[PDB]
Amino acid sequence: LFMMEATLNDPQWSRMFMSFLKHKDARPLRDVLAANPNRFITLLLMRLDLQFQAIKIISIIVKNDDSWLASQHSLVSQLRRVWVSENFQERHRKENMAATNWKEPKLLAYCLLNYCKRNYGDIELLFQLLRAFTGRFLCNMTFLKEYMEEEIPKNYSIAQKRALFFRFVDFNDPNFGDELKAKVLQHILNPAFLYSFEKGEDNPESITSVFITKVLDPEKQADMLDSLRIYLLQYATLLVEHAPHHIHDNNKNRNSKLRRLMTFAWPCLLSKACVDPACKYSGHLLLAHIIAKFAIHKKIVLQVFHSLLKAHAMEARAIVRQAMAILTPAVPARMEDGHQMLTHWTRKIIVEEGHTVPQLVHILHLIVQHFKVYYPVRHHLVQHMVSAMQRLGFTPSVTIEQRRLAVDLSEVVIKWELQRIKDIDKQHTDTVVNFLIRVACQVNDNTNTAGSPGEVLSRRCVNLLKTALRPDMWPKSELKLQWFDKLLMTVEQPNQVNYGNICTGLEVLSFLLTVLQSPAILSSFKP
Amino acid sequence: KKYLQFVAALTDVNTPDETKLKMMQEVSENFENVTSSPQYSTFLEHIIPRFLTFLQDGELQEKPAQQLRKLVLEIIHRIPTNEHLRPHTKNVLSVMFRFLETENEENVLICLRIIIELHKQFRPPITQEIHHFLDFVKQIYKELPKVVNRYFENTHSIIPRGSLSLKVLAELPIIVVLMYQLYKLNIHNVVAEELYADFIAAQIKTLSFLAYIIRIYQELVTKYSQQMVKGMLQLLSNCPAETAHLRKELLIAAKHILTTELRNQFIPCMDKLFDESILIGSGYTARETLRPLAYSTLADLVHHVRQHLPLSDLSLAVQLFAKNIDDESLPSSIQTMSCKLLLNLVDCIRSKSEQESGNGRDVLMRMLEVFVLKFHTIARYQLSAIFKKCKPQSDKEDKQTFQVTDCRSLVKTLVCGVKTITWGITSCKQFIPNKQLQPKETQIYIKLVKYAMQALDIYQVQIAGNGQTYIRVANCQTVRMKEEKEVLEHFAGVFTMMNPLTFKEIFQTTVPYMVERISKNYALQIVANSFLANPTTSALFATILVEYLLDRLPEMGSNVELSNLYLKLFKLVFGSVSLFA
C-alpha cells in the first residue's frame, strides 16, 4: 500500500511509511522488503524523488538489519552507481540553497560503508572518498572519516597488507577511467598509511613497486600534480621513517641518484620552480629524513641545510622547523671532520645577511634557540646573536615575535653559561645581562595598565635574571642607574605611573640582594 | 689597520675577478669588527669615491659586474651613519633611473633598498631628486599598459620595489600634493592582461600596485574610477593560486579596503556579489590555509552590507556558509563567527520576508537544521574529546584549555542563534500569529532539544590552578559563576515562545530524557524552573511533568539519586502552582 509510486511520492505517506519501518516492531515489514531487493533497482534511476525515497528506505533497512549486505550485490551495483555518478554530484551541488532531499548523501554514504565493511571491495572503499575530504560535506564527513581513521587501521590489513596495497596501486587503471587527479587519487593515500603506521611499528615487494611505478613526476607528466605531490612526499617520508628501514630501503634505493626518491625530490626543491611552499618544503623534509638515516652523499647535506636556511622567508615555519628537528642532529654527527666547516658556513650565511631581513633573522634565531644542546661548542658565534638581540629589543615590538624571541634567546645564553660553568665574551655577556635588565622592565609597559596578558613573560624574565646571577657571571654586571631613574622617576609625572615601576622595584630588590652578597655596590647607589 | 689594508688594495682592472671579492671580505671583516670615532667618517669619505669609480665602469649576466653590484650591496648594508649620506644619495639616484623595466639584474632592487634605508634620516633638501624619481614613477606607471601589450605569446620585480619604496617614502615626510598625482596614476593603472611565469610576475606587480593603492583606507580621495577597482578585483580572481604569501598579502590589502563604509556599499552591486566564498577568495587547488582570514573578511563585509541584499544573494550566501560551518578542519573560532553572522542575518531575512512573497521560511528552517546538526555534532564529539582526558580526583594542555573555552563559547553562540531563529520562523509566512508548527519542524525541534540538552553539558569541566582540566561534581547547588545560567535560560526561552500545543507534544515526547539528563546533569534543573516561571507555558509543562512522575513514583524507593531528583521536581511544581495558582 505504501510502495505505490503515487503514494510513495507523496511526502505524507512516505514519512508515515518511514516512521513505521523505523519502529522496533517493524521486523516483518522489513523482511518483505529484504526479500525483494530488485524493487529498489526500478527506483534508483519529472520523477527523480523515487531515487531519494529508495535510498532512504535502504538506509533504514541496513540500520535495522546490519547483516543484509552480502545479499544485495545487485542493489549496490546501482547504489554505488548513483554515488559515483557525476549527475548526482552536479544535481546535489549546483543548487542547494533550500533544496529538499538534503540528507540523501549522508544515508547513501552510510549504507555504502555498511556494505563495504562486511566485504572488502577496494574500488568501492576508495570511491567512498568522493565525500570523505572532497566533494560535498554536510554531516557526511565524520561518520566515514572516523571509521577510516580508527576502524580501518585496526583489523583491515591484518593478513594482506601487501596485497591490499598492490590493489590500491592497481586502482590507477579503474581510477583514471573516472578520476584522474588528486581529488580522489590523493585522498587514497590516507586510508592506507593509517594502517601502514599502526603496523609500521613484511611487505618488501610493495617498497620496490612504489618507487618504479610512481617514477619521478609520475607518468612523466608534472602538470597534473597539484596536491598529490605533497601527500606522496609525506608517504615517502613516513616510509623511510618507520615501516621499511635500511634493511628494506637500501635494496632499491641504491639507485637514489637515478629516478628513485632522491631525484624525485632534489630537482624540484633545488630549482626556483614549484613556487608552492608546501611541496617544496615537504621535499626538503623528505631529503632531511633520507639523510638522517642513510644516503651519506658528497656533502649534499650542507646544500640542503643552506637551501632550507635561506628559503624559510615568510610562512615556512612548521615544515622547516620539522626538517631542522629531523636534520639538525644528523649533519654534525655525520660531519665530525667538518664541525668547524659547517659552523663556519653557518657564520657565513649569517654575516651575508647584511640586509637583516627581519623575518629571516627571527626564523634563524628561533632555529638556533630550539637546539640549545648543539651549539655549546661554538661560543665564538654568540657575539652575532647577542648583537642581534640587542637591536631586536630596541625596536617597537608591538608584535609578539621580536622581544619574546629576544628574551628567550637571552635564556639560551643563560643555559649555555650554566652548562659551561657546570660542565665566554665578558663585555657581551655584561651587555646581555644589562639588556635582560632593561627588556624585563620595558615589556611591562608594552601591555596596558591592567586587564591584559604580558605580565607572565615579564615575571619569567625576572626569574631568568634572578637565576643568571647565581653563576659566577654576576660580578661584572653593570647597574642601569639611568634607566631605573628615568622609569621610576616617572612617578614624579602623575601620567603613566603603571605597575612598570613595581617590576622596577622588584629588580631593584634583586640588585639589593646582589649588593647584600657584594657590598661594593654601595658606591653605585648614588643615582 | 683596516684603513691602510683597504687603501693598499686599490685595484681598478688589473685583477677584476677575485681582488674585488677579497676586498669585499676585508670590508665585511671591517664591518663585523668595531670601529672607533677617529676611524668612522674618513672610511666612508674614502669609500664614496671608490664606489663612484667602481660604478662608472661596467653598467642573465654573470660577469664581474655581479660582484661589483654585490660590493655595492655590502656598502649599503654598512648603514654606518648619516653625515656621509649626501653623495651616496646622488650616486644611488643616478644609477636608479637607467635601464629599468627591462631584462636588468638586481642592481635596481638593492638601489631601492638603499633608497628606503636612506630617507629614514629625514633629509629636506633631497626632495628634488626623489621628486624626479616620482616623475619616473609617473612614467613607468603610464607605460605599464604598453609593456604588457607589447609582450604577447608570440625581471618584472622592479614595480613592487618601487611601489613599496614610494609608500615608505610618502608615509614619513610632510604631507604634500604629490600623493594626488599618485592617485591620478592609480586611474591609469594597468588592468588588462616560463613566459607565463613572467605574466604571473606582471600580475603580482599589479598586486603590489594595489597594495600601494591601500591608501583608499586613509584620507579621503576623489574616487571616480570604480571601473578600475572592479577590473583589479577581477584580476585578483585571475591571480595565481600557487603563491600563498602573495595571495595572503592580497587578501589583507582587500580586507583593509573593505574596512571603510564608503567602499562597502559599492561591493554588493558588483557581479551580484556572487564572488563570495566560492573558490575565488582562496586558492583554487594549491593551498587553503589562509582560509580563516578570507572567511573573516567576507563575514565582516556581508555583515556591514546585509541591509541591501535580495533573496538570491542571501540564499546563496547561506548556502556557501553552512558548508564551512561544519568543516572540522577550521578552528572553532571561525565556527562561532559564522554562527554569529547567521543569527544576525536571520533578523534581516525575517524583516525582508515582507517582500517578494517571503520565501524566507524555507531558508530559515534549512539553517535551523544545520544549527541543530552542529549542536548534535558538538555534543557527540567535543564532549567525548574532553572526557577522554579528564583527571579524576585531581604545553598541549594550555591549548586544550583554550579549545575548551572556545567550545564553551560555541555552545552559547549556538543557543543564542537557535533562539533568534525560533523567533524568526514564528514571525514570517497571509501570516497568522502563533501558527501551529508543522510535523517536520516539530520533530526537528524535538531532536533540537534532545541534542542541545547534551551540548549544554560542556559547563561541567573546570580549569585548575596548575593547568590540568577537572570534571565537576554531579550536584553542588552553586551559581556556576553565572556563565551558563543565562545560557540555559535562553535555551528555555527558545521554547517558551512557541505555540502552546506544540510545546505540549515536544515535551510530552522529551520529558523522560529531560529528567534523565537532569539526574545526570543537575545544572539543567533551571530549564524546568524557567519553563514553570514563564506564563502561557508553565501549566502545560507542569501537567506533563506530573503526569510523567506519577507513573515513576515507585522508582523513588530503589535509589536515592532519582528520588531526590523527583523531590526537587515536585518542589518546583508546587512553587509554580503557588506562582500560577
XYZ file of N, CA and C in Angstrom, chain B residues 352-486:
405
model
N 12.971 41.237 5.742
C 12.798 41.308 4.295
C 11.740 40.341 3.779
N 11.291 39.389 4.601
C 10.270 38.446 4.162
C 9.005 39.140 3.675
N 8.781 40.397 4.068
C 7.607 41.116 3.589
C 7.643 41.306 2.077
N 8.831 41.279 1.481
C 8.989 41.495 0.051
C 9.105 40.167 -0.690
N 8.729 40.196 -1.970
C 8.868 39.042 -2.860
C 8.171 37.808 -2.299
N 7.023 38.008 -1.653
C 6.199 36.920 -1.134
C 6.918 36.097 -0.070
N 8.002 36.625 0.496
C 8.708 35.933 1.556
C 9.724 34.926 1.063
N 9.374 33.640 1.133
C 10.288 32.560 0.780
C 11.415 32.459 1.800
N 11.268 33.145 2.937
C 12.286 33.083 3.971
C 12.104 31.911 4.915
N 10.865 31.441 5.073
C 10.605 30.301 5.951
C 11.480 29.113 5.578
N 11.591 28.829 4.276
C 12.363 27.673 3.836
C 13.826 27.794 4.243
N 14.450 28.939 3.960
C 15.868 29.111 4.268
C 16.086 29.118 5.777
N 15.179 29.763 6.512
C 15.313 29.818 7.965
C 15.232 28.423 8.571
N 14.302 27.598 8.083
C 14.212 26.229 8.578
C 15.431 25.416 8.162
N 15.907 25.610 6.930
C 17.057 24.857 6.449
C 18.328 25.198 7.213
N 18.457 26.429 7.710
C 19.604 26.793 8.530
C 19.410 26.456 10.002
N 18.174 26.463 10.508
C 17.915 25.861 11.811
C 18.324 24.393 11.805
N 18.142 23.727 10.661
C 18.566 22.336 10.536
C 20.071 22.195 10.729
N 20.860 23.048 10.073
C 22.308 22.949 10.242
C 22.713 23.378 11.648
N 21.961 24.288 12.269
C 22.247 24.653 13.654
C 22.063 23.458 14.586
N 20.948 22.738 14.450
C 20.729 21.566 15.294
C 21.740 20.475 14.960
N 22.148 20.382 13.693
C 23.173 19.412 13.325
C 24.502 19.731 13.992
N 24.880 21.011 14.034
C 26.096 21.400 14.741
C 25.971 21.120 16.232
N 24.808 21.423 16.814
C 24.553 21.063 18.205
C 24.833 19.585 18.444
N 24.233 18.724 17.622
C 24.402 17.284 17.789
C 25.861 16.879 17.630
N 26.535 17.411 16.609
C 27.922 17.027 16.364
C 28.815 17.414 17.533
N 28.630 18.618 18.080
C 29.475 19.041 19.191
C 29.151 18.236 20.443
N 27.863 17.993 20.710
C 27.503 17.193 21.873
C 28.018 15.766 21.750
N 28.215 15.287 20.520
C 28.693 13.924 20.318
C 30.211 13.837 20.422
N 30.931 14.794 19.833
C 32.382 14.703 19.716
C 33.130 15.564 20.725
N 32.776 16.845 20.859
C 33.507 17.711 21.778
C 33.427 17.191 23.207
N 32.244 16.753 23.638
C 32.101 16.206 24.984
C 33.003 14.993 25.179
N 33.067 14.118 24.173
C 33.925 12.942 24.276
C 35.397 13.338 24.295
N 35.776 14.324 23.480
C 37.172 14.743 23.430
C 37.657 15.221 24.793
N 36.804 15.934 25.532
C 37.219 16.464 26.827
C 37.170 15.377 27.895
N 36.197 14.466 27.800
C 36.060 13.431 28.820
C 37.166 12.388 28.716
N 37.747 12.212 27.532
C 38.833 11.250 27.350
C 40.158 11.736 27.919
N 40.203 12.912 28.553
C 41.441 13.410 29.140
C 41.227 14.036 30.515
N 40.061 13.850 31.129
C 39.823 14.394 32.459
C 40.664 13.659 33.495
N 41.146 14.408 34.489
C 41.930 13.846 35.580
C 41.011 13.614 36.774
N 40.546 12.390 37.021
C 39.627 12.168 38.148
C 40.335 12.362 39.482
N 39.678 13.085 40.387
C 40.210 13.361 41.720
C 41.579 14.038 41.622
N 41.581 15.214 41.000
C 42.806 15.985 40.825
C 43.340 16.465 42.169
N 52.600 23.975 26.689
C 52.227 22.567 26.643
C 50.886 22.397 25.934
N 50.659 21.207 25.375
C 49.415 20.948 24.659
C 48.196 21.187 25.542
N 48.346 21.046 26.861
C 47.218 21.272 27.757
C 46.806 22.740 27.777
N 47.767 23.656 27.642
C 47.428 25.073 27.588
C 46.529 25.375 26.397
N 46.796 24.740 25.254
C 45.960 24.942 24.076
C 44.645 24.181 24.181
N 44.647 23.017 24.834
C 43.395 22.310 25.069
C 42.465 23.121 25.961
N 43.023 23.898 26.889
C 42.196 24.776 27.713
C 41.518 25.841 26.858
N 42.279 26.474 25.960
C 41.682 27.444 25.049
C 40.629 26.796 24.164
N 40.863 25.556 23.728
C 39.863 24.851 22.931
C 38.589 24.610 23.734
N 38.732 24.225 25.003
C 37.567 24.029 25.861
C 36.798 25.335 26.006
N 37.520 26.448 26.161
C 36.854 27.744 26.252
C 36.145 28.103 24.951
N 36.764 27.805 23.808
C 36.115 28.066 22.527
C 34.839 27.249 22.388
N 34.857 25.998 22.854
C 33.647 25.180 22.807
C 32.580 25.718 23.756
N 33.001 26.185 24.934
C 32.060 26.764 25.887
C 31.401 28.015 25.325
N 32.137 28.795 24.532
C 31.536 29.946 23.864
C 30.704 29.528 22.656
N 31.095 28.439 21.991
C 30.358 27.959 20.829
C 28.967 27.488 21.223
N 28.859 26.795 22.357
C 27.544 26.333 22.800
C 26.635 27.524 23.089
N 27.189 28.579 23.687
C 26.402 29.775 23.980
C 25.951 30.460 22.696
N 26.876 30.638 21.751
C 26.512 31.237 20.471
C 25.455 30.412 19.752
N 25.551 29.083 19.824
C 24.561 28.227 19.182
C 23.198 28.383 19.842
N 23.166 28.449 21.175
C 21.898 28.648 21.875
C 21.271 29.974 21.457
N 22.082 31.034 21.417
C 21.559 32.343 21.038
C 21.048 32.338 19.601
N 21.796 31.715 18.691
C 21.350 31.638 17.312
C 20.059 30.858 17.167
N 19.938 29.755 17.911
C 18.721 28.951 17.846
C 17.535 29.749 18.370
N 17.743 30.515 19.446
C 16.669 31.371 19.944
C 16.254 32.395 18.896
N 17.228 33.099 18.313
C 16.906 34.112 17.312
C 16.199 33.496 16.111
N 16.551 32.258 15.759
C 15.923 31.605 14.614
C 14.494 31.202 14.952
N 14.282 30.649 16.148
C 12.926 30.343 16.588
C 12.057 31.593 16.576
N 12.621 32.732 16.981
C 11.888 33.990 16.869
C 11.584 34.316 15.412
N 12.426 33.848 14.493
C 12.275 34.158 13.085
C 11.155 33.407 12.394
N 11.214 32.071 12.415
C 10.250 31.279 11.658
C 8.834 31.462 12.185
N 8.682 31.858 13.447
C 7.375 32.083 14.044
C 6.853 33.495 13.796
N 7.525 34.271 12.933
C 7.104 35.643 12.664
C 7.208 35.988 11.181
N 7.068 34.999 10.301
C 7.138 35.241 8.866
C 6.497 34.073 8.131
N 5.580 34.404 7.224
C 4.876 33.408 6.422
C 4.342 32.271 7.289
N -1.882 34.572 4.140
C -1.094 35.564 4.864
C -0.572 34.987 6.176
N 0.206 35.786 6.901
C 0.766 35.340 8.166
C -0.300 35.337 9.256
N -0.186 34.373 10.165
C -1.095 34.253 11.303
C -0.246 34.162 12.567
N -0.527 34.953 13.601
C 0.336 34.930 14.790
C 0.248 33.603 15.526
N 1.407 33.118 15.972
C 1.493 31.884 16.751
C 0.881 30.710 15.991
N 1.233 30.593 14.713
C 0.750 29.483 13.901
C 1.310 28.167 14.422
N 0.475 27.131 14.408
C 0.904 25.812 14.857
C 1.946 25.254 13.897
N 3.100 24.868 14.435
C 4.175 24.350 13.603
C 3.761 23.041 12.941
N 4.347 22.777 11.775
C 4.051 21.560 11.043
C 4.827 20.384 11.633
N 4.452 19.152 11.277
C 5.156 17.988 11.846
C 6.654 18.000 11.599
N 7.092 18.469 10.430
C 8.517 18.466 10.112
C 9.305 19.279 11.131
N 8.996 20.574 11.244
C 9.718 21.415 12.190
C 9.441 21.007 13.631
N 8.299 20.371 13.896
C 8.037 19.878 15.247
C 9.026 18.782 15.631
N 9.203 17.784 14.761
C 10.200 16.752 15.023
C 11.607 17.333 15.024
N 11.860 18.333 14.177
C 13.164 18.986 14.182
C 13.427 19.631 15.537
N 12.408 20.259 16.128
C 12.575 20.876 17.442
C 12.725 19.824 18.533
N 12.019 18.699 18.399
C 12.201 17.601 19.346
C 13.658 17.154 19.352
N 14.203 16.874 18.165
C 15.609 16.491 18.077
C 16.521 17.619 18.541
N 16.130 18.872 18.302
C 16.942 20.005 18.724
C 17.086 20.037 20.239
N 15.972 19.904 20.958
C 16.052 19.880 22.416
C 16.813 18.648 22.883
N 16.559 17.491 22.263
C 17.238 16.267 22.679
C 18.751 16.397 22.546
N 19.220 17.075 21.501
C 20.651 17.211 21.263
C 21.266 18.389 22.002
N 20.486 19.438 22.274
C 21.020 20.600 22.972
C 21.092 20.364 24.472
N 20.211 19.523 25.018
C 20.320 19.181 26.430
C 21.624 18.455 26.734
N 22.278 17.896 25.716
C 23.592 17.287 25.877
C 24.716 18.290 25.651
N 24.583 19.146 24.634
C 25.617 20.138 24.359
C 25.831 21.058 25.554
N 24.761 21.357 26.294
C 24.876 22.201 27.475
C 25.712 21.562 28.575
N 26.053 20.279 28.447
C 26.871 19.590 29.435
C 28.332 20.021 29.403
N 28.717 20.894 28.468
C 30.102 21.340 28.387
C 30.502 22.161 29.605
N 29.534 22.664 30.369
C 29.810 23.514 31.519
C 30.145 22.725 32.781
N 30.455 21.435 32.661
C 30.825 20.607 33.802
C 32.328 20.373 33.893
N 33.121 21.060 33.077
C 34.576 20.963 33.108
C 35.130 22.273 33.647
N 36.155 22.179 34.493
C 36.752 23.338 35.136
C 38.254 23.342 34.898
N 38.857 24.518 35.050
C 40.293 24.710 34.887
C 40.902 24.923 36.264
N 41.961 24.176 36.563
C 42.618 24.251 37.856
C 43.769 25.257 37.817
N 44.368 25.483 38.984
C 45.479 26.401 39.111
C 46.813 25.865 38.651
N 46.860 24.616 38.186
C 48.086 24.012 37.683
C 48.078 23.773 36.180
N 46.921 23.833 35.529
C 46.813 23.640 34.094
C 45.996 22.437 33.678
N 45.795 21.453 34.551
C 45.049 20.254 34.204
C 43.554 20.499 34.351
N 42.777 19.914 33.444
C 41.331 20.056 33.493
C 40.747 19.205 34.617
N 39.599 19.639 35.131
C 38.925 18.968 36.233
C 37.447 18.827 35.907
N 36.898 17.644 36.154
C 35.483 17.373 35.924
C 34.705 17.775 37.168
N 33.606 18.499 36.969
C 32.806 18.982 38.080
C 32.027 17.835 38.721
N 31.560 18.077 39.945
C 30.800 17.083 40.697
C 29.394 16.986 40.123
N 28.658 15.946 40.521
C 27.309 15.750 39.999
C 26.369 16.849 40.475
N 26.375 17.133 41.776
C 25.479 18.130 42.347
C 26.191 18.864 43.471
N 26.199 20.196 43.394
C 26.791 21.022 44.440
C 25.938 22.216 44.839
N 24.867 22.535 44.110
C 23.969 23.635 44.458
C 24.735 24.955 44.559
N 25.295 25.368 43.427
C 26.074 26.595 43.322
C 25.491 27.477 42.217
N 26.181 28.585 41.934
C 25.768 29.507 40.880
C 26.467 29.233 39.555
N 27.517 28.410 39.549
C 28.239 28.061 38.327
C 28.863 29.288 37.671
N 29.236 30.278 38.481
C 29.881 31.506 38.025
C 28.980 32.355 37.133
N 27.696 32.018 37.028
C 26.707 32.731 36.227
C 26.950 32.586 34.728
N 27.969 31.832 34.310
C 28.285 31.740 32.887
C 27.203 30.980 32.129
N 26.741 29.859 32.681
C 25.773 29.016 31.992
C 24.330 29.329 32.359
N 24.092 29.971 33.506
C 22.724 30.276 33.913
C 21.950 30.970 32.798
N 22.466 32.086 32.291
C 21.830 32.777 31.177
C 21.745 31.908 29.930
